[PDB]
Curated annotation (Swiss-Prot), chains A, B:
<feature type="binding site">
    <location>
        <position position="202"/>
    </location>
    <ligand>
        <name>Mg(2+) 1</name>
    </ligand>
</feature>
<comment type="function">
    <text>RT is a multifunctional enzyme that converts the viral dimeric RNA genome into dsDNA in the cytoplasm, shortly after virus entry into the cell. This enzyme displays a DNA polymerase activity that can copy either DNA or RNA templates, and a ribonuclease H (RNase H) activity that cleaves the RNA strand of RNA-DNA heteroduplexes in a partially processive 3' to 5' endonucleasic mode. Conversion of viral genomic RNA into dsDNA requires many steps. A tRNA binds to the primer-binding site (PBS) situated at the 5' end of the viral RNA.</text>
</comment>
<feature type="binding site">
    <location>
        <position position="201"/>
    </location>
    <ligand>
        <name>Mg(2+) 1</name>
    </ligand>
</feature>
<protein>
    <recommendedName>
        <fullName>Reverse transcriptase/ribonuclease H</fullName>
    </recommendedName>
</protein>
<feature type="domain" description="Reverse transcriptase">
    <location>
        <begin position="59"/>
        <end position="250"/>
    </location>
</feature>
<feature type="binding site">
    <location>
        <position position="171"/>
    </location>
    <ligand>
        <name>RNA</name>
    </ligand>
</feature>
<feature type="binding site">
    <location>
        <position position="41"/>
    </location>
    <ligand>
        <name>RNA</name>
    </ligand>
</feature>
<feature type="binding site">
    <location>
        <position position="93"/>
    </location>
    <ligand>
        <name>RNA</name>
    </ligand>
</feature>
<comment type="subunit">
    <text>The reverse transcriptase is a monomer (Potential). Interacts (via RNase domains) with host release factor ETF1; this interaction is essential for translational readthrough of amber codon between viral gag and pol genes, as well as for viral replication.</text>
</comment>
<feature type="binding site">
    <location>
        <position position="107"/>
    </location>
    <ligand>
        <name>RNA</name>
    </ligand>
</feature>
<feature type="binding site">
    <location>
        <position position="127"/>
    </location>
    <ligand>
        <name>Mg(2+) 1</name>
    </ligand>
</feature>
<feature type="binding site">
    <location>
        <position position="91"/>
    </location>
    <ligand>
        <name>RNA</name>
    </ligand>
</feature>
<feature type="binding site">
    <location>
        <position position="173"/>
    </location>
    <ligand>
        <name>RNA</name>
    </ligand>
</feature>
């Protein structure tokens, strides 16, 4: 019923998310930074065929697009045999160095976790799937993240870049945490007897009874689905007196 | 023979390293930062027993020591069942925010990899085991990394801190890369017909023939062992015409 009552809230039934209320992000560069182009080492036939399916799927969904940029960072085949199903990892160290640091406004989640009232002993734990891919990058900031993808067989010979917040980018955890926090401000305001804790893509809802936890979890799944986020149905812990959150056992 | 000729160069035969020429590091804090103490959530009997063996071994080797600090960051049980062999991970986000950024002086390794002459076609690839643990922290900077460990059964009730560069600290990769680079400057100077590339704890030696690669690899293992670094014998690729470095196939 959790699956069928809220089909848009789950990665399994609702596809990839897209945070609808979040405007495409602009990434500020340090005032004196210049674009940097790092060399891409020729990939072997085997790593290229292990990686191409991920590149195909991302392209298909609009998550990667062709571009021309003065920036370039290397792609690495994160490792199997050859031809044999690998995955692509981008080394963004040189972009990370040139971008302004963004630090958090949210209250520290560990400190909040320790101040949880004992009246609140029913919990739901959710984790969001592919959370950074829910946030769009503004066209003016997409060039920063380009890499080279030469696959004449694929008919792509040039650079590709990310249209969503990429993994490996130093500010992605903070940028996603701040955006979701702001997106869930209405839920928190509307449900004063529930406590919602979050840390990047890990969420904890706590309530005073099983029935209040059940309704607060339904309202939260309705809200997340509508906002464009997707939880993993395979990992969810719903209305329990004992749960693991952040690896900690709450009981 | 590689194992028996150079017993101090390998993690397997030579123990944990300690870089002998490297002075204990002082970690500069941002001029306006203040110590911060984050709350530690009570660990369950089961995560505590899964984690205690790692804490015991580290204590035994002097890598962790008891202390009293105004700084504190949480320890998380990175996850199994209960009692069941987990591992400890420290969340250093709040210290990472308060420490000055250190950026590299070394030339970019990907760019160097692409400028490798074709005359150089015999290679050895080594990766250093527990490389950050080879570098010591100065006593004045050890307090930054404290965490709470209350195990009255162990007879430890208070904080512990790292005496070596910890994992999770934002500058550790750069600090280790810069130190090893400087430590191997004499080898590079003494063997002008060999090319040594490095990126944090991954090393590539390239030479013009099999015999020159063999002798340069012996000299490099002798040097690393003497400097206090330890390579992983289980991963090494020695004197080959085809190797994988950084996931890239060189052939």
């Amino acid at each position: 019923t959790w699956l069928s009552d809220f089909p848009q809230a789950w990665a399994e039934t609702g596809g990839m998310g897209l945070a609808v209320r979040q405007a495409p992000l602009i990434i500020p560069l340090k005032a004196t930074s210049t674009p940097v182009s790092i060399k891409q080492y020729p990939m072997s036939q085997e790593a290229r065929l292990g990686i191409k399916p991920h590149i195909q799927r991302l392209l298909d969904q609009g998550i990667l697009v062709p571009c021309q940029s003065p920036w370039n960072t290397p792609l690495l085949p994160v490792k199997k045999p050859g031809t044999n199903d690998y995955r692509p990892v981008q080394d963004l160290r040189e972009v990370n160095k040139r971008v302004e640091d963004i630090h958090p406004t949210v209250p520290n989640p560990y400190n909040l976790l320790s101040g949880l009232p004992p009246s609140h002993q029913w919990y739901t734990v959710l984790d969001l799937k592919d959370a950074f891919f829910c946030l769009r990058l503004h066209p003016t900031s997409q060039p920063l993240f380009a890499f080279e993808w030469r696959d004449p067989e694929m008919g792509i010979s040039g650079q590709l870049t990310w249209t969503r917040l990429p993994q490996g980018f130093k500010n992605s955890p903070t940028l996603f945490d701040e955006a979701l926090h702001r997106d869930l401000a209405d839920f928190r305001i509307q449900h004063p007897d529930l406590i919602l804790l979050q840390y990047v893509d890990d969420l904890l809802l706590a309530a005073t009874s099983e029935l209040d936890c059940q309704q607060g979890t339904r309202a939260l799944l309705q809200t997340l689905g509508n906002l464009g986020y997707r939880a993993s149905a395979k990992k969810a812990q719903i209305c329990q007196k004992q749960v693991k959150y952040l690896g900690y056992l709450l009981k």
